[PDB]
Scaffold this motif. Sequence first.
Motif, PDB file in Angstrom:
ATOM      1  N   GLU A  12       3.119   0.583  -0.044  1.00 47.24           N
ATOM      2  CA  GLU A  12       1.600   0.754   0.288  1.00 47.24           C
ATOM      3  C   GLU A  12       0.862   2.527   0.035  1.00 47.24           C
ATOM      4  O   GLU A  12       1.750   2.691  -0.093  1.00 47.24           O
ATOM      5  N   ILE A  13      -0.569   2.108  -0.347  1.00 49.73           N
ATOM      6  CA  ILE A  13      -1.024   3.131  -1.543  1.00 49.73           C
ATOM      7  C   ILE A  13      -1.865   3.487  -0.800  1.00 49.73           C
ATOM      8  O   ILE A  13      -2.613   4.940  -0.637  1.00 49.73           O
ATOM      9  N   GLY A  14      -2.393   3.589   0.850  1.00 46.62           N
ATOM     10  CA  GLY A  14      -3.107   3.964   1.853  1.00 46.62           C
ATOM     11  C   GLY A  14      -3.495   3.134   3.183  1.00 46.62           C
ATOM     12  O   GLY A  14      -3.097   2.348   3.166  1.00 46.62           O
ATOM     13  N   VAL A  21      -4.159  -0.444   2.683  1.00 48.97           N
ATOM     14  CA  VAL A  21      -4.158  -0.806   1.655  1.00 48.97           C
ATOM     15  C   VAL A  21      -2.656  -1.136   0.949  1.00 48.97           C
ATOM     16  O   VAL A  21      -1.900   0.001   0.718  1.00 48.97           O
ATOM     17  N   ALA A  34      -5.454  -3.671  -6.068  1.00 46.76           N
ATOM     18  CA  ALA A  34      -5.238  -3.050  -4.274  1.00 46.76           C
ATOM     19  C   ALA A  34      -5.549  -4.468  -3.817  1.00 46.76           C
ATOM     20  O   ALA A  34      -7.391  -4.658  -3.660  1.00 46.76           O
ATOM     21  N   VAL A  73     -15.441   0.639  -8.450  1.00 41.33           N
ATOM     22  CA  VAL A  73     -14.878   0.104  -7.940  1.00 41.33           C
ATOM     23  C   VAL A  73     -15.717  -1.484  -7.838  1.00 41.33           C
ATOM     24  O   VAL A  73     -16.605  -1.268  -8.050  1.00 41.33           O
ATOM     25  N   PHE A  91      -9.815  -5.065  -4.870  1.00 43.67           N
ATOM     26  CA  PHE A  91      -9.934  -5.051  -5.766  1.00 43.67           C
ATOM     27  C   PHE A  91      -9.075  -4.964  -7.093  1.00 43.67           C
ATOM     28  O   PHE A  91      -7.998  -4.811  -6.950  1.00 43.67           O
ATOM     29  N   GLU A  92      -9.755  -4.234  -8.195  1.00 40.41           N
ATOM     30  CA  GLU A  92      -9.364  -4.006  -9.004  1.00 40.41           C
ATOM     31  C   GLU A  92      -9.028  -2.793  -9.578  1.00 40.41           C
ATOM     32  O   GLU A  92      -8.644  -2.262  -8.241  1.00 40.41           O
ATOM     33  N   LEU A  93      -7.503  -2.845  -9.487  1.00 40.75           N
ATOM     34  CA  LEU A  93      -6.314  -1.934  -9.360  1.00 40.75           C
ATOM     35  C   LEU A  93      -7.362  -0.281  -9.989  1.00 40.75           C
ATOM     36  O   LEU A  93      -7.888  -0.451 -11.182  1.00 40.75           O
ATOM     37  N   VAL A  94      -6.924   0.664  -9.127  1.00 40.77           N
ATOM     38  CA  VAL A  94      -7.618   2.063 -10.225  1.00 40.77           C
ATOM     39  C   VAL A  94      -6.507   3.251 -10.239  1.00 40.77           C
ATOM     40  O   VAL A  94      -5.816   3.434  -9.271  1.00 40.77           O
ATOM     41  N   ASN A  95      -5.818   2.360 -11.926  1.00 45.12           N
ATOM     42  CA  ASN A  95      -3.749   3.724 -11.831  1.00 45.12           C
ATOM     43  C   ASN A  95      -3.713   4.850 -10.975  1.00 45.12           C
ATOM     44  O   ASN A  95      -2.508   4.794 -10.377  1.00 45.12           O
ATOM     45  N   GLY A  97      -5.298   6.395  -9.125  1.00 44.85           N
ATOM     46  CA  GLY A  97      -5.812   7.298  -7.420  1.00 44.85           C
ATOM     47  C   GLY A  97      -6.902   8.378  -7.427  1.00 44.85           C
ATOM     48  O   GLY A  97      -7.316   8.693  -8.326  1.00 44.85           O
ATOM     49  N   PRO A  98      -6.653   8.406  -6.500  1.00 44.00           N
ATOM     50  CA  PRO A  98      -7.611   9.537  -6.398  1.00 44.00           C
ATOM     51  C   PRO A  98      -8.414  10.739  -7.165  1.00 44.00           C
ATOM     52  O   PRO A  98      -6.991  11.683  -7.335  1.00 44.00           O
ATOM     53  N   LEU A 143     -12.028   7.245  -7.602  1.00 45.02           N
ATOM     54  CA  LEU A 143     -10.002   6.932  -8.131  1.00 45.02           C
ATOM     55  C   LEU A 143     -10.088   6.964  -9.598  1.00 45.02           C
ATOM     56  O   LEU A 143     -11.550   6.983 -10.434  1.00 45.02           O
ATOM     57  N   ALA A 153     -15.643   4.818  -5.234  1.00 48.66           N
ATOM     58  CA  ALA A 153     -14.645   4.080  -4.076  1.00 48.66           C
ATOM     59  C   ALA A 153     -15.239   3.982  -3.351  1.00 48.66           C
ATOM     60  O   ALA A 153     -16.639   5.211  -2.414  1.00 48.66           O
TER      61      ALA A 153
HETATM   62  C1  LIG Z   1      -8.674  -0.266  -2.138  1.00 50.57           C
HETATM   63  C2  LIG Z   1      -9.240   0.265  -2.087  1.00 50.57           C
HETATM   64  C3  LIG Z   1      -9.978   1.793  -2.618  1.00 50.57           C
HETATM   65  C4  LIG Z   1     -10.655   1.244  -3.610  1.00 50.57           C
HETATM   66  O1  LIG Z   1     -11.690   0.980  -3.728  1.00 50.57           O
HETATM   67  N1  LIG Z   1      -9.896   0.730  -5.186  1.00 50.57           N
HETATM   68  C5  LIG Z   1     -10.676  -0.303  -6.166  1.00 50.57           C
HETATM   69  C6  LIG Z   1      -8.842   0.872  -5.025  1.00 50.57           C
HETATM   70  C7  LIG Z   1      -7.920   0.693  -6.247  1.00 50.57           C
HETATM   71  N2  LIG Z   1      -6.821   1.636  -7.204  1.00 50.57           N
HETATM   72  C8  LIG Z   1      -6.701   2.221  -5.995  1.00 50.57           C
HETATM   73  N3  LIG Z   1      -5.124   3.050  -6.290  1.00 50.57           N
HETATM   74  C9  LIG Z   1      -4.030   3.261  -5.638  1.00 50.57           C
HETATM   75  C10 LIG Z   1      -4.885   4.612  -5.033  1.00 50.57           C
HETATM   76  C11 LIG Z   1      -3.481   5.113  -4.417  1.00 50.57           C
HETATM   77  C12 LIG Z   1      -2.828   5.407  -4.792  1.00 50.57           C
HETATM   78  C13 LIG Z   1      -1.074   6.745  -4.524  1.00 50.57           C
HETATM   79  O2  LIG Z   1      -0.394   6.950  -4.793  1.00 50.57           O
HETATM   80  N4  LIG Z   1      -1.173   6.685  -2.521  1.00 50.57           N
HETATM   81  C14 LIG Z   1      -0.630   7.203  -2.208  1.00 50.57           C
HETATM   82  C15 LIG Z   1       0.745   6.541  -1.743  1.00 50.57           C
HETATM   83  C16 LIG Z   1       1.827   7.184  -0.752  1.00 50.57           C
HETATM   84  N5  LIG Z   1       1.244   8.075   0.947  1.00 50.57           N
HETATM   85  C17 LIG Z   1       1.870   8.883   1.224  1.00 50.57           C
HETATM   86  C18 LIG Z   1       0.000   8.742   0.117  1.00 50.57           C
HETATM   87  C19 LIG Z   1      -0.772   7.704  -0.624  1.00 50.57           C
HETATM   88  C20 LIG Z   1      -1.817   4.400  -5.975  1.00 50.57           C
HETATM   89  C21 LIG Z   1      -2.832   3.597  -6.342  1.00 50.57           C
HETATM   90  O3  LIG Z   1      -2.635   3.291  -7.394  1.00 50.57           O
HETATM   91  C22 LIG Z   1      -1.312   2.728  -8.230  1.00 50.57           C
HETATM   92  N6  LIG Z   1      -6.952   2.657  -4.535  1.00 50.57           N
HETATM   93  C23 LIG Z   1      -8.325   1.924  -4.400  1.00 50.57           C
HETATM   94  N7  LIG Z   1      -8.279   2.515  -2.799  1.00 50.57           N
HETATM   95  C24 LIG Z   1      -7.420   3.375  -2.218  1.00 50.57           C
HETATM   96  C25 LIG Z   1      -8.027   4.863  -2.715  1.00 50.57           C
HETATM   97  C26 LIG Z   1      -6.991   5.491  -1.907  1.00 50.57           C
HETATM   98  C27 LIG Z   1      -6.332   4.517  -1.526  1.00 50.57           C
HETATM   99  C28 LIG Z   1      -6.393   2.839  -1.549  1.00 50.57           C
END
Ligand SMILES: CC[C@@H]1C(=O)N(C)c2cnc(Nc3ccc(C(=O)NC4CCN(C)CC4)cc3OC)nc2N1C1CCCC1
Length: 271
Positions: A12-14, A21, A34, A73, A91-95, A97-98, A143, A153
């Motif tokens: 879980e990334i979000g 997410v 993602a 994104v 979505f395409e991953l955005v490696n 993160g924020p 991101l 994003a």
């Molecule tokens: C899908 C929604 C949006 C989007 O539009 N795209 C395209 C996206 C593409 N890639 C990512 N990538 C990553 C985003 C967050 C992390 C990460 O490390 N998250 C932590 C995990 C542990 N948690 C306690 C705290 C947060 C890793 C990512 O890639 C390896 N996020 C994207 N997001 C969001 C941006 C914040 C949530 C997701």
Amino acid sequence: SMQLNQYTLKDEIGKGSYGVVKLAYNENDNTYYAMKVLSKKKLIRGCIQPRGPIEQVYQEIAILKKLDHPNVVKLVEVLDDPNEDHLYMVFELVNQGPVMEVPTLKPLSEDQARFYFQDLIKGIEYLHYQKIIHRDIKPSNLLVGEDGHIKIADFGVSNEFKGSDALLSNTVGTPAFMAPESLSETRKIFSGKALDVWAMGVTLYCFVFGQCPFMDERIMCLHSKIKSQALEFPDQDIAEDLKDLITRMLDKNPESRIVVPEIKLHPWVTR
Ligand SMILES: CC[C@@H]1C(=O)N(C)c2cnc(Nc3ccc(C(=O)NC4CCN(C)CC4)cc3OC)nc2N1C1CCCC1
């Protein structure tokens, strides 16, 4: 893990009100994506009555489908079975993160901020060209990709318009980033592009200070500070051309606030 069609869902990334997410590995193309997972039943649960929550999500999707730019994104797939509670947005991953969480004790350097701010200009210019007002520009929605550049994003409250600019009445976005003209108690009408410029200005201040220019845990008091408090800079010390640019983006009057064509020509940006 679990399987969802061709994807293996993993960490879980979000998470948020929207749902969660997941990191999703596509077994067909050996690539990570993602996957935002939304529950229709959970979504059901300037103060205009907006359209319903599932309907807002479809508006977001419709906007995302129009956008193809390196600093925005990329939505690749939507899975929405009429007989299932869940809706999936791939979505395409955005490696990486924020770019940052605010507040942080670890602000960006001025040069790193300029680099990302240039990406932010290019993405916003593209969105505005495509007649989209983003309405939630902030560091956590920018991101960092594998190429080191940012992508914009979270189009969850974005507006699509026809004509030269949007004519808006709804007060949406993240409070600390909302422009003063959107915060009147009186019902009024404001243009969209300047809202994004204001949010860019708050964002740029956050980049270099790690904290927003207007801060209060009490949202009502925050709104008051945005409307009435002069912009101030801490003692810790940025270049004067940077202070000028932030000052011009954080002009409380949207009629005199700096526009994107001028931001592109600002000394701090072009050096
Ligand atoms: C899908 C929604 C949006 C989007 O539009 N795209 C395209 C996206 C593409 N890639 C990512 N990538 C990553 C985003 C967050 C992390 C990460 O490390 N998250 C932590 C995990 C542990 N948690 C306690 C705290 C947060 C890793 C990512 O890639 C390896 N996020 C994207 N997001 C969001 C941006 C914040 C949530 C997701």
